[PDB]
């Protein structure tokens, strides 16, 4: 009579909830390992404001014919 | 920060090819970055002048042994 255990069903549901959360952490971990080591944008990596990488040089003797694409 | 500037305060000698290469880097992502090879090779040729030097070595060889 003093034996008052939790039922089989509630036990199985609790273990299932635990395993579900562990699988959620697994997917989050993989997804972040993938989000890192993914190529970013230049603005996120170097310069948000001057996002044009292209280097403009000096101006004291700017020769027409020195720009190129 | 002081890149692409000459001794007179202007654009250097090899700036233009560097500009084309930097343009094509901005156009491409790391997977498509292979397209920037000939631009980079042109930059290195302007800098170090190797392929033109070897061209002239071939010309000089023809002036050197095939005549004497």
Short mmCIF file of N, CA, C and O in Angstrom, two decimals:
data_model
loop_
_atom_site.label_atom_id
_atom_site.label_comp_id
_atom_site.label_asym_id
_atom_site.label_seq_id
_atom_site.Cartn_x
_atom_site.Cartn_y
_atom_site.Cartn_z
N UNK A 1 0.80 -1.21 0.00
CA UNK A 1 0.00 0.00 0.00
C UNK A 1 0.84 1.27 0.00
O UNK A 1 0.48 2.24 -0.67
N UNK A 2 1.95 1.28 0.73
CA UNK A 2 2.82 2.45 0.76
C UNK A 2 3.57 2.65 -0.54
O UNK A 2 4.20 3.70 -0.71
N UNK A 3 3.54 1.67 -1.43
CA UNK A 3 4.13 1.78 -2.75
C UNK A 3 3.24 2.67 -3.59
O UNK A 3 2.19 2.24 -4.08
N UNK A 4 3.66 3.92 -3.80
CA UNK A 4 2.92 4.90 -4.59
C UNK A 4 3.86 5.48 -5.64
O UNK A 4 4.27 6.64 -5.56
N UNK A 5 4.24 4.68 -6.63
CA UNK A 5 5.09 5.17 -7.71
C UNK A 5 4.34 5.95 -8.77
O UNK A 5 3.15 5.76 -9.01
N UNK A 6 5.10 6.80 -9.44
CA UNK A 6 4.62 7.46 -10.64
C UNK A 6 4.31 6.42 -11.70
O UNK A 6 5.00 5.40 -11.82
N UNK A 7 3.25 6.66 -12.45
CA UNK A 7 2.78 5.72 -13.46
C UNK A 7 3.80 5.54 -14.57
O UNK A 7 4.75 6.31 -14.69
N UNK A 8 3.59 4.52 -15.39
CA UNK A 8 4.45 4.31 -16.54
C UNK A 8 4.30 5.44 -17.54
O UNK A 8 5.29 5.87 -18.16
N UNK A 9 3.10 5.98 -17.66
CA UNK A 9 2.84 6.93 -18.73
C UNK A 9 3.49 8.27 -18.45
O UNK A 9 4.12 8.86 -19.33
N UNK A 10 3.34 8.76 -17.22
CA UNK A 10 3.95 10.03 -16.87
C UNK A 10 5.46 9.96 -16.92
O UNK A 10 6.13 10.92 -17.34
N UNK A 11 6.02 8.82 -16.52
CA UNK A 11 7.46 8.64 -16.62
C UNK A 11 7.91 8.74 -18.07
O UNK A 11 8.90 9.41 -18.39
N UNK A 12 7.20 8.04 -18.96
CA UNK A 12 7.62 8.04 -20.36
C UNK A 12 7.49 9.43 -20.96
O UNK A 12 8.34 9.86 -21.74
N UNK A 13 6.45 10.17 -20.56
CA UNK A 13 6.30 11.52 -21.08
C UNK A 13 7.41 12.43 -20.59
O UNK A 13 7.92 13.27 -21.35
N UNK A 14 7.82 12.29 -19.33
CA UNK A 14 8.88 13.13 -18.80
C UNK A 14 10.21 12.84 -19.49
O UNK A 14 10.95 13.75 -19.86
N UNK A 15 10.53 11.56 -19.65
CA UNK A 15 11.76 11.21 -20.35
C UNK A 15 11.71 11.69 -21.79
O UNK A 15 12.72 12.13 -22.35
N UNK A 16 10.53 11.68 -22.40
CA UNK A 16 10.42 12.15 -23.77
C UNK A 16 10.65 13.64 -23.85
O UNK A 16 11.29 14.12 -24.79
N UNK A 17 10.12 14.39 -22.89
CA UNK A 17 10.35 15.83 -22.83
C UNK A 17 11.83 16.16 -22.66
O UNK A 17 12.36 17.09 -23.29
N UNK A 18 12.53 15.37 -21.84
CA UNK A 18 13.95 15.60 -21.64
C UNK A 18 14.70 15.34 -22.94
O UNK A 18 15.56 16.13 -23.36
N UNK A 19 14.41 14.21 -23.58
CA UNK A 19 15.11 13.88 -24.81
C UNK A 19 14.79 14.89 -25.90
O UNK A 19 15.64 15.21 -26.74
N UNK A 20 13.57 15.42 -25.90
CA UNK A 20 13.22 16.42 -26.88
C UNK A 20 14.05 17.68 -26.69
O UNK A 20 14.57 18.24 -27.65
N UNK A 21 14.20 18.12 -25.44
CA UNK A 21 14.99 19.32 -25.22
C UNK A 21 16.45 19.09 -25.55
O UNK A 21 17.13 19.99 -26.06
N UNK A 22 16.95 17.89 -25.28
CA UNK A 22 18.33 17.60 -25.64
C UNK A 22 18.52 17.61 -27.15
O UNK A 22 19.53 18.12 -27.65
N UNK A 23 17.55 17.09 -27.89
CA UNK A 23 17.63 17.16 -29.34
C UNK A 23 17.53 18.59 -29.83
O UNK A 23 18.16 18.96 -30.83
N UNK A 24 16.77 19.43 -29.13
CA UNK A 24 16.69 20.83 -29.51
C UNK A 24 18.05 21.50 -29.35
O UNK A 24 18.49 22.26 -30.23
N UNK A 25 18.72 21.23 -28.24
CA UNK A 25 20.06 21.76 -28.05
C UNK A 25 21.02 21.23 -29.10
O UNK A 25 21.93 21.93 -29.54
N UNK A 26 20.83 19.98 -29.52
CA UNK A 26 21.68 19.43 -30.56
C UNK A 26 21.52 20.19 -31.86
O UNK A 26 22.50 20.55 -32.52
N UNK A 27 20.28 20.45 -32.24
CA UNK A 27 20.06 21.15 -33.50
C UNK A 27 20.56 22.58 -33.42
O UNK A 27 21.12 23.09 -34.39
N UNK A 28 20.38 23.24 -32.27
CA UNK A 28 20.90 24.59 -32.12
C UNK A 28 22.41 24.60 -32.22
O UNK A 28 23.00 25.51 -32.82
N UNK A 29 23.06 23.59 -31.67
CA UNK A 29 24.51 23.54 -31.70
C UNK A 29 25.02 23.34 -33.11
O UNK A 29 25.97 23.99 -33.54
N UNK A 30 24.39 22.44 -33.87
CA UNK A 30 24.81 22.24 -35.24
C UNK A 30 24.56 23.49 -36.06
O UNK A 30 25.39 23.91 -36.87
N UNK A 31 23.40 24.10 -35.86
CA UNK A 31 23.04 25.28 -36.63
C UNK A 31 23.99 26.44 -36.36
O UNK A 31 24.26 27.24 -37.25
N UNK A 32 24.51 26.54 -35.14
CA UNK A 32 25.47 27.60 -34.86
C UNK A 32 26.85 27.26 -35.39
O UNK A 32 27.56 28.14 -35.88
N UNK A 33 27.24 26.00 -35.31
CA UNK A 33 28.50 25.60 -35.91
C UNK A 33 28.48 25.87 -37.41
O UNK A 33 29.53 26.12 -38.01
N UNK A 34 27.30 25.82 -38.02
CA UNK A 34 27.16 26.18 -39.42
C UNK A 34 27.05 27.69 -39.64
O UNK A 34 27.47 28.20 -40.68
N UNK A 35 26.45 28.42 -38.70
CA UNK A 35 26.27 29.86 -38.89
C UNK A 35 27.61 30.57 -38.81
O UNK A 35 27.95 31.39 -39.66
N UNK A 36 28.38 30.26 -37.78
CA UNK A 36 29.80 30.52 -37.83
C UNK A 36 30.38 29.71 -39.00
O UNK A 36 29.71 28.86 -39.57
N UNK A 37 31.60 30.04 -39.39
CA UNK A 37 32.26 29.48 -40.57
C UNK A 37 31.33 29.45 -41.79
O UNK A 37 31.36 28.51 -42.58
N UNK A 38 30.50 30.48 -41.91
CA UNK A 38 29.79 30.83 -43.13
C UNK A 38 30.25 32.21 -43.53
O UNK A 38 30.43 33.08 -42.67
N UNK A 39 30.43 32.41 -44.82
CA UNK A 39 30.95 33.67 -45.29
C UNK A 39 29.97 34.79 -44.97
O UNK A 39 28.76 34.64 -45.14
N UNK A 40 30.50 35.90 -44.47
CA UNK A 40 29.71 37.05 -44.08
C UNK A 40 29.79 38.10 -45.18
O UNK A 40 30.33 37.86 -46.26
N UNK A 41 29.22 39.26 -44.91
CA UNK A 41 29.34 40.42 -45.78
C UNK A 41 30.52 41.29 -45.35
O UNK A 41 31.00 41.20 -44.22
N UNK A 42 30.99 42.12 -46.28
CA UNK A 42 32.12 42.99 -45.98
C UNK A 42 31.77 43.96 -44.87
O UNK A 42 32.62 44.27 -44.02
N UNK A 43 30.54 44.45 -44.85
CA UNK A 43 30.15 45.41 -43.83
C UNK A 43 30.15 44.78 -42.45
O UNK A 43 30.57 45.40 -41.47
N UNK A 44 29.67 43.55 -42.34
CA UNK A 44 29.69 42.89 -41.05
C UNK A 44 31.09 42.51 -40.62
O UNK A 44 31.30 42.23 -39.44
N UNK A 45 32.05 42.48 -41.54
CA UNK A 45 33.38 41.97 -41.27
C UNK A 45 34.43 43.06 -41.09
O UNK A 45 35.36 42.87 -40.31
N UNK A 46 34.31 44.18 -41.80
CA UNK A 46 35.32 45.23 -41.79
C UNK A 46 34.75 46.59 -41.45
O UNK A 46 35.16 47.19 -40.46
N UNK A 47 33.81 47.10 -42.23
CA UNK A 47 33.41 48.50 -42.16
C UNK A 47 31.95 48.70 -42.50
O UNK A 47 31.58 48.64 -43.68
N UNK A 48 31.07 48.89 -41.53
CA UNK A 48 29.67 49.14 -41.86
C UNK A 48 29.40 50.38 -42.68
O UNK A 48 28.49 50.41 -43.51
N UNK A 49 30.19 51.41 -42.44
CA UNK A 49 29.90 52.71 -43.03
C UNK A 49 30.48 52.83 -44.42
O UNK A 49 29.75 52.98 -45.40
N UNK A 50 31.81 52.77 -44.52
CA UNK A 50 32.49 52.78 -45.81
C UNK A 50 32.58 51.35 -46.31
O UNK A 50 33.63 50.71 -46.27
N UNK A 51 31.46 50.86 -46.79
CA UNK A 51 31.36 49.49 -47.23
C UNK A 51 31.91 49.27 -48.63
O UNK A 51 31.88 48.14 -49.11
N UNK A 52 32.37 50.32 -49.31
CA UNK A 52 32.97 50.17 -50.62
C UNK A 52 34.42 49.75 -50.42
O UNK A 52 35.23 50.58 -49.99
N UNK A 53 34.79 48.50 -50.67
CA UNK A 53 36.19 48.11 -50.46
C UNK A 53 37.16 48.85 -51.35
O UNK A 53 38.34 48.99 -50.99
N UNK A 54 36.70 49.33 -52.49
CA UNK A 54 37.56 49.78 -53.58
C UNK A 54 38.44 50.91 -53.08
O UNK A 54 37.91 51.89 -52.53
N UNK A 55 39.76 50.85 -53.25
CA UNK A 55 40.60 51.87 -52.65
C UNK A 55 40.77 53.07 -53.56
O UNK A 55 41.33 52.94 -54.65
N UNK A 56 40.29 54.22 -53.13
CA UNK A 56 40.63 55.46 -53.79
C UNK A 56 41.94 55.95 -53.19
O UNK A 56 42.09 55.99 -51.96
N UNK A 57 42.86 56.30 -54.05
CA UNK A 57 44.20 56.68 -53.67
C UNK A 57 44.35 58.17 -53.51
O UNK A 57 43.38 58.90 -53.25
N UNK A 58 45.57 58.64 -53.69
CA UNK A 58 45.88 60.04 -53.53
C UNK A 58 45.15 60.94 -54.49
O UNK A 58 44.41 60.47 -55.36
N UNK A 59 45.34 62.24 -54.31
CA UNK A 59 44.62 63.24 -55.08
C UNK A 59 45.51 64.37 -55.57
O UNK A 59 45.02 65.23 -56.30
N UNK A 60 46.78 64.41 -55.18
CA UNK A 60 47.63 65.55 -55.51
C UNK A 60 48.05 65.56 -56.97
O UNK A 60 48.42 66.62 -57.49
N UNK A 61 48.01 64.43 -57.65
CA UNK A 61 48.36 64.38 -59.05
C UNK A 61 47.50 63.40 -59.79
O UNK A 61 47.98 62.63 -60.64
N UNK A 62 46.22 63.42 -59.46
CA UNK A 62 45.27 62.46 -59.97
C UNK A 62 45.26 62.49 -61.49
O UNK A 62 44.90 63.50 -62.10
N UNK A 63 45.68 61.38 -62.09
CA UNK A 63 45.87 61.30 -63.52
C UNK A 63 44.65 60.71 -64.17
O UNK A 63 44.32 59.55 -63.87
N UNK A 64 43.94 61.41 -65.04
CA UNK A 64 42.84 60.76 -65.75
C UNK A 64 43.36 59.64 -66.63
O UNK A 64 44.21 59.85 -67.49
N UNK A 65 42.82 58.46 -66.40
CA UNK A 65 43.35 57.23 -66.96
C UNK A 65 43.82 56.24 -65.93
O UNK A 65 44.26 55.14 -66.31
N UNK A 66 43.75 56.56 -64.64
CA UNK A 66 44.24 55.71 -63.58
C UNK A 66 43.15 54.92 -62.90
O UNK A 66 43.45 53.94 -62.22
N UNK A 67 41.90 55.32 -63.08
CA UNK A 67 40.79 54.52 -62.61
C UNK A 67 40.64 53.30 -63.50
O UNK A 67 40.99 53.32 -64.68
N UNK A 68 40.12 52.22 -62.92
CA UNK A 68 39.92 51.01 -63.70
C UNK A 68 38.92 50.14 -62.98
O UNK A 68 38.70 50.28 -61.77
N UNK A 69 38.30 49.24 -63.74
CA UNK A 69 37.26 48.36 -63.23
C UNK A 69 37.46 46.94 -63.73
O UNK A 69 37.98 46.09 -63.01
N UNK B 1 45.43 52.39 -45.35
CA UNK B 1 45.11 53.73 -44.88
C UNK B 1 45.96 54.75 -45.63
O UNK B 1 45.50 55.86 -45.92
N UNK B 2 47.19 54.37 -45.97
CA UNK B 2 48.06 55.14 -46.85
C UNK B 2 48.43 54.33 -48.07
O UNK B 2 49.54 54.41 -48.59
N UNK B 3 47.48 53.53 -48.54
CA UNK B 3 47.71 52.58 -49.61
C UNK B 3 47.19 53.15 -50.91
O UNK B 3 46.09 53.72 -50.95
N UNK B 4 47.95 52.95 -51.98
CA UNK B 4 47.66 53.55 -53.26
C UNK B 4 48.14 54.96 -53.42
O UNK B 4 47.57 55.71 -54.23
N UNK B 5 49.16 55.36 -52.67
CA UNK B 5 49.70 56.71 -52.70
C UNK B 5 51.16 56.62 -53.12
O UNK B 5 51.88 55.70 -52.72
N UNK B 6 51.59 57.59 -53.91
CA UNK B 6 52.92 57.61 -54.49
C UNK B 6 53.89 58.42 -53.65
O UNK B 6 53.58 58.85 -52.54
N UNK B 7 55.08 58.63 -54.19
CA UNK B 7 56.07 59.47 -53.54
C UNK B 7 55.79 60.95 -53.73
O UNK B 7 56.27 61.76 -52.94
N UNK B 8 55.05 61.31 -54.77
CA UNK B 8 54.59 62.67 -54.99
C UNK B 8 53.21 62.92 -54.43
O UNK B 8 52.64 63.98 -54.70
N UNK B 9 52.66 61.99 -53.67
CA UNK B 9 51.33 62.14 -53.13
C UNK B 9 50.19 61.76 -54.04
O UNK B 9 49.06 62.19 -53.81
N UNK B 10 50.46 60.98 -55.09
CA UNK B 10 49.45 60.58 -56.04
C UNK B 10 49.36 59.08 -56.22
O UNK B 10 49.96 58.31 -55.47
N UNK B 11 48.61 58.65 -57.22
CA UNK B 11 48.41 57.24 -57.48
C UNK B 11 49.72 56.58 -57.90
O UNK B 11 50.49 57.15 -58.67
N UNK B 12 49.95 55.37 -57.41
CA UNK B 12 51.22 54.71 -57.65
C UNK B 12 51.28 54.20 -59.09
O UNK B 12 50.51 54.60 -59.96
N UNK B 13 52.23 53.31 -59.35
CA UNK B 13 52.43 52.82 -60.70
C UNK B 13 51.49 51.66 -61.02
O UNK B 13 51.02 51.54 -62.15
N UNK B 14 51.22 50.82 -60.03
CA UNK B 14 50.42 49.61 -60.20
C UNK B 14 49.04 49.74 -59.58
O UNK B 14 48.38 48.74 -59.30
N UNK B 15 48.59 50.97 -59.33
CA UNK B 15 47.32 51.15 -58.65
C UNK B 15 46.15 50.64 -59.46
O UNK B 15 45.20 50.11 -58.90
N UNK B 16 46.19 50.81 -60.77
CA UNK B 16 45.00 50.57 -61.57
C UNK B 16 44.61 49.10 -61.55
O UNK B 16 43.43 48.76 -61.41
N UNK B 17 45.59 48.23 -61.66
CA UNK B 17 45.31 46.81 -61.62
C UNK B 17 44.82 46.39 -60.25
O UNK B 17 43.94 45.52 -60.14
N UNK B 18 45.35 47.00 -59.20
CA UNK B 18 44.86 46.76 -57.86
C UNK B 18 43.42 47.19 -57.75
O UNK B 18 42.63 46.56 -57.05
N UNK B 19 43.05 48.23 -58.48
CA UNK B 19 41.68 48.70 -58.42
C UNK B 19 40.76 47.72 -59.12
O UNK B 19 39.67 47.43 -58.63
N UNK B 20 41.20 47.19 -60.25
CA UNK B 20 40.37 46.21 -60.94
C UNK B 20 40.22 44.95 -60.11
O UNK B 20 39.12 44.38 -60.03
N UNK B 21 41.28 44.53 -59.45
CA UNK B 21 41.20 43.34 -58.62
C UNK B 21 40.30 43.57 -57.42
O UNK B 21 39.53 42.69 -57.04
N UNK B 22 40.36 44.76 -56.83
CA UNK B 22 39.52 45.01 -55.68
C UNK B 22 38.06 45.15 -56.09
O UNK B 22 37.16 44.73 -55.36
N UNK B 23 37.83 45.69 -57.28
CA UNK B 23 36.47 45.72 -57.81
C UNK B 23 35.93 44.31 -57.98
O UNK B 23 34.81 44.01 -57.55
N UNK B 24 36.72 43.43 -58.57
CA UNK B 24 36.21 42.10 -58.83
C UNK B 24 36.13 41.26 -57.56
O UNK B 24 35.38 40.29 -57.51
N UNK B 25 36.91 41.59 -56.52
CA UNK B 25 36.68 40.96 -55.23
C UNK B 25 35.34 41.39 -54.65
O UNK B 25 34.57 40.56 -54.15
N UNK B 26 35.04 42.69 -54.71
CA UNK B 26 33.76 43.17 -54.21
C UNK B 26 32.60 42.57 -54.98
O UNK B 26 31.51 42.38 -54.43
N UNK B 27 32.80 42.29 -56.27
CA UNK B 27 31.74 41.68 -57.07
C UNK B 27 31.48 40.23 -56.68
O UNK B 27 30.35 39.76 -56.81
N UNK B 28 32.50 39.52 -56.18
CA UNK B 28 32.44 38.08 -56.00
C UNK B 28 32.50 37.70 -54.53
O UNK B 28 33.08 38.40 -53.70
N UNK B 29 31.88 36.56 -54.23
CA UNK B 29 31.99 35.90 -52.94
C UNK B 29 33.07 34.82 -53.00
O UNK B 29 33.57 34.47 -54.07
N UNK B 30 33.42 34.27 -51.82
CA UNK B 30 34.61 33.43 -51.69
C UNK B 30 34.57 32.23 -52.61
O UNK B 30 35.63 31.71 -53.00
N UNK B 31 33.38 31.76 -52.96
CA UNK B 31 33.26 30.65 -53.90
C UNK B 31 33.57 31.09 -55.31
O UNK B 31 34.29 30.41 -56.04
N UNK B 32 33.05 32.25 -55.70
CA UNK B 32 33.23 32.78 -57.04
C UNK B 32 34.51 33.58 -57.19
O UNK B 32 34.74 34.17 -58.25
N UNK B 33 35.35 33.60 -56.16
CA UNK B 33 36.53 34.45 -56.15
C UNK B 33 37.60 33.97 -57.13
O UNK B 33 38.54 34.72 -57.40
N UNK B 34 37.46 32.77 -57.69
CA UNK B 34 38.41 32.29 -58.68
C UNK B 34 38.45 33.18 -59.91
O UNK B 34 39.46 33.22 -60.61
N UNK B 35 37.36 33.90 -60.18
CA UNK B 35 37.32 34.78 -61.35
C UNK B 35 38.38 35.87 -61.27
O UNK B 35 38.77 36.42 -62.30
N UNK B 36 38.85 36.18 -60.06
CA UNK B 36 39.81 37.25 -59.82
C UNK B 36 41.25 36.82 -60.08
O UNK B 36 42.18 37.52 -59.68
N UNK B 37 41.46 35.68 -60.69
CA UNK B 37 42.83 35.24 -60.89
C UNK B 37 43.58 36.09 -61.90
O UNK B 37 44.65 36.60 -61.56
N UNK B 38 43.12 36.24 -63.15
CA UNK B 38 43.90 37.04 -64.11
C UNK B 38 44.10 38.48 -63.68
O UNK B 38 45.16 39.05 -63.97
N UNK B 39 43.15 39.09 -62.98
CA UNK B 39 43.38 40.42 -62.46
C UNK B 39 44.53 40.43 -61.46
O UNK B 39 45.39 41.32 -61.48
N UNK B 40 44.58 39.43 -60.59
CA UNK B 40 45.65 39.35 -59.61
C UNK B 40 46.98 39.08 -60.28
O UNK B 40 48.01 39.62 -59.88
N UNK B 41 46.97 38.24 -61.30
CA UNK B 41 48.19 37.97 -62.03
C UNK B 41 48.69 39.21 -62.76
O UNK B 41 49.89 39.46 -62.82
N UNK B 42 47.77 40.02 -63.28
CA UNK B 42 48.17 41.28 -63.89
C UNK B 42 48.80 42.21 -62.87
O UNK B 42 49.79 42.89 -63.15
N UNK B 43 48.24 42.24 -61.66
CA UNK B 43 48.83 43.03 -60.59
C UNK B 43 50.24 42.57 -60.29
O UNK B 43 51.17 43.38 -60.17
N UNK B 44 50.42 41.26 -60.15
CA UNK B 44 51.75 40.75 -59.83
C UNK B 44 52.72 40.99 -60.97
O UNK B 44 53.92 41.17 -60.74
N UNK B 45 52.23 41.00 -62.20
CA UNK B 45 53.12 41.28 -63.31
C UNK B 45 53.55 42.73 -63.30
O UNK B 45 54.71 43.04 -63.59
N UNK B 46 52.64 43.64 -62.96
CA UNK B 46 53.02 45.04 -62.87
C UNK B 46 54.04 45.24 -61.78
O UNK B 46 55.00 46.01 -61.92
N UNK B 47 53.86 44.55 -60.67
CA UNK B 47 54.77 44.71 -59.55
C UNK B 47 56.15 44.17 -59.88
O UNK B 47 57.14 44.91 -59.87
N UNK B 48 56.23 42.88 -60.18
CA UNK B 48 57.50 42.18 -60.22
C UNK B 48 58.06 41.96 -61.61
O UNK B 48 59.26 41.71 -61.74
N UNK B 49 57.23 42.07 -62.65
CA UNK B 49 57.70 42.09 -64.03
C UNK B 49 58.44 40.81 -64.39
O UNK B 49 59.60 40.84 -64.79
N UNK B 50 57.77 39.68 -64.23
CA UNK B 50 58.41 38.40 -64.47
C UNK B 50 58.17 37.89 -65.88
O UNK B 50 59.12 37.53 -66.57
N UNK B 51 56.92 37.84 -66.31
CA UNK B 51 56.64 37.29 -67.63
C UNK B 51 57.24 38.15 -68.74
O UNK B 51 57.74 37.62 -69.74
N UNK B 52 57.20 39.47 -68.58
CA UNK B 52 57.88 40.34 -69.53
C UNK B 52 59.39 40.14 -69.49
O UNK B 52 60.07 40.20 -70.52
N UNK B 53 59.93 39.86 -68.31
CA UNK B 53 61.36 39.64 -68.21
C UNK B 53 61.74 38.36 -68.95
O UNK B 53 62.74 38.33 -69.67
N UNK B 54 60.93 37.32 -68.80
CA UNK B 54 61.20 36.06 -69.49
C UNK B 54 61.02 36.20 -71.00
O UNK B 54 61.76 35.59 -71.78
N UNK B 55 60.03 36.98 -71.42
CA UNK B 55 59.88 37.31 -72.83
C UNK B 55 61.17 37.92 -73.37
O UNK B 55 61.70 37.48 -74.39
N UNK B 56 61.71 38.89 -72.65
CA UNK B 56 62.93 39.52 -73.11
C UNK B 56 64.11 38.57 -73.05
O UNK B 56 65.03 38.68 -73.86
N UNK B 57 64.12 37.63 -72.12
CA UNK B 57 65.19 36.64 -72.11
C UNK B 57 65.13 35.76 -73.34
O UNK B 57 66.17 35.40 -73.91
N UNK B 58 63.93 35.44 -73.81
CA UNK B 58 63.82 34.66 -75.04
C UNK B 58 64.30 35.47 -76.24
O UNK B 58 65.02 34.96 -77.11
N UNK B 59 63.91 36.74 -76.29
CA UNK B 59 64.38 37.60 -77.38
C UNK B 59 65.89 37.68 -77.36
O UNK B 59 66.55 37.64 -78.41
N UNK B 60 66.47 37.83 -76.18
CA UNK B 60 67.92 37.97 -76.10
C UNK B 60 68.60 36.68 -76.51
O UNK B 60 69.65 36.70 -77.15
N UNK B 61 67.99 35.53 -76.20
CA UNK B 61 68.57 34.27 -76.62
C UNK B 61 68.60 34.18 -78.13
O UNK B 61 69.58 33.72 -78.72
N UNK B 62 67.54 34.64 -78.77
CA UNK B 62 67.53 34.62 -80.23
C UNK B 62 68.56 35.59 -80.79
O UNK B 62 69.14 35.35 -81.86
N UNK B 63 68.81 36.70 -80.11
CA UNK B 63 69.86 37.60 -80.57
C UNK B 63 71.26 37.09 -80.26
O UNK B 63 72.23 37.63 -80.80
N UNK B 64 71.38 36.07 -79.42
CA UNK B 64 72.64 35.67 -78.82
C UNK B 64 73.26 34.44 -79.48
O UNK B 64 74.44 34.47 -79.84
N UNK B 65 72.49 33.37 -79.65
CA UNK B 65 72.99 32.13 -80.23
C UNK B 65 72.61 31.95 -81.69
O UNK B 65 73.41 31.43 -82.47
N UNK B 66 71.41 32.36 -82.08
CA UNK B 66 70.98 32.15 -83.45
C UNK B 66 71.69 33.07 -84.44
O UNK B 66 71.58 32.85 -85.65
N UNK B 67 72.37 34.10 -83.95
CA UNK B 67 73.23 34.96 -84.76
C UNK B 67 74.71 34.63 -84.64
O UNK B 67 75.44 34.80 -85.62
N UNK B 68 75.16 34.17 -83.48
CA UNK B 68 76.56 33.78 -83.28
C UNK B 68 76.62 32.37 -82.69
O UNK B 68 77.45 32.06 -81.85
#
